[PDB]
Amino acid sequence: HDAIMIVKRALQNKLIVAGGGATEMEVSKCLRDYSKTIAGKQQMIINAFAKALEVIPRQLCENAGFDAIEILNKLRLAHSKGEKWYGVVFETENIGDNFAKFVWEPALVKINALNSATEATNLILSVDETITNKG
């Protein structure tokens, strides 16, 4: 029954990415690499977005009681070399390969969440001067 539930959840969406912040770390690393080859304020904005992408693993570690500084440093060190499947392990406070451990989240869910967050951020920041009525 346990295995059937696991495989059912996996089959409901076969398009998956490494969980535990590994996907966020890979996206942040790629964004930083691209920004290193991009001039202008675009570089600063891309760096800020990449840094912000690391909030999810940071808050997950904080809520889990782990040492945020050490776990994040280890994740950065491991993810920057070799495989990109390294992520935060919640069973034990350390960094390991989530893909090998079968820890994943849907890719479409991640894409939709990123799009929604970007839309909300742009909409709130789209206005620098506003005259808003009270009610």
């Binding site: 202008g40 675009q42 839309e119 909409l123």
Partner: protein, 194 residues
């Protein structure tokens, strides 16, 4: 001719459409989107476009002007020349009226995040050029570009075909001048308590 129920995005609606006989003179636009604010903005844009289309009639409806502030810069130059030619104290007012038109390029530059201190002189140079002849030539239709990623100077209007209706601009100028004169003509306001 045909009456059916059609499903669009999970919502079923009834449509009365004409195919061969009694051809309908009306059409409907259906917008789809998960954000209500975006849908409202799109609806406003569609309404504005529909209103503008009705303006393509004979009275300067079809006439096209170079948009993105190019027309504004040309008018600035022409009005400045006219004010210089105009004798008397009217020259100061003509020059100020010309300067008032500099807002459009300034607004375009600011809203696009471009540095006005560089765009404005570049626009002035582009619209005020010296050519090897008695008649200006080359790219005299340069407008105000927004870029946003990477660019130098501004792009020509013909590259993106950004044109404005002559009737719209003319009527807007007339109404704006009338309103400005009306406001300026008031030097005292007296009201009675209700």
């Amino acid at each position: 001719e045909t009456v059916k129920t059609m499903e669009i995005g999970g919502d079923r609606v009834t449509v009365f459409k004409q195919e061969q006989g009694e051809i309908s003179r009306t059409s409907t636009i259906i917008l789809r989107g998960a954000t209500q604010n975006n849908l409202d903005d799109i609806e406003r844009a569609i309404d504005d476009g529909v209103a503008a289309v009705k303006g393509l009639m004979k009275p300067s409806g079809g006439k096209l002007l170079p948009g993105a502030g190019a027309t504004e810069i040309e008018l600035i130059s022409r009005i400045t020349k006219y004010g210089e030619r105009t004798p008397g104290l009217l020259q100061l007012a003509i020059k100020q009226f010309a300067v008032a038109f500099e807002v459009v390029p300034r607004t375009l530059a600011e809203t696009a995040g471009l540095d006005v201190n560089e765009v404005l002189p570049n626009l002035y140079a582009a619209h005020n050029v010296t050519e090897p002849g008695a008649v200006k030539t080359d790219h005299l239709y340069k407008g105000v570009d927004i870029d946003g990623e990477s660019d130098e100077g501004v792009k020509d209007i013909r590259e993106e075909n950004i044109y404005d209706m002559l009737a719209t601009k003319k009527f807007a100028i007339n109404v704006a001048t009338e309103a400005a004169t009306t406001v300026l003509s008031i030097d005292q306001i007296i009201m009675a308590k209700k």
